[PDB]
């Protein structure tokens, strides 16, 4: 929210250069579950975890892509079989 609230000052390239690499591991984590379906977590920054299918839990970026990620992981976890 420091990115959206001010973008018209000398701090904007500096804080953008901070956030741009501060979101690199989160995107690296997401690039596994969408392109191989492998889920990685040791930190608890996800609510997702790995009945007849229901052990997938839901107990950051905008919510407009998050639910699409949530279904595109389970699709590959079916395609693993």
């Amino acid at each position: 929210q420091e990115a959206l609230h001010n973008c018209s000052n000398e701090h904007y390239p500096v804080l953008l250069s901070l956030l741009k690499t501060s979101c690199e591991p989160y995107t690296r984590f997401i690039h596994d579950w969408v392109y191989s379906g492998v889920f990685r977590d040791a930190y608890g920054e996800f609510m997702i975890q790995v009945k007849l299918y229901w052990t997938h839990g839901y107990v950051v970026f905008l919510k407009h892509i998050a639910h699409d990620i949530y279904v595109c992981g389970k699709t590959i976890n079916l395609l693993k079989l």
């Binding site: 973008c7 969408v34 970026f61 892509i65 699409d68 990620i69 279904v71 595109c72 699709t75 079916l78």
Partner: protein, 35 residues
């Protein structure tokens, strides 16, 4: 301004492809529509 217009575009275009290919694998091989 910060928004995704160069990052989410090769991902949201990929989600639809995964969904469509998985549905296609169901239809022509397991024949759910015959049941």
């Amino acid at each position: 301004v910060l928004m995704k217009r160069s990052i989410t575009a090769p991902l949201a275009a990929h989600i639809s492809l995964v969904n469509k290919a998985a549905v296609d694998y169901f239809f022509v091989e397991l024949h759910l529509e015959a049941h």
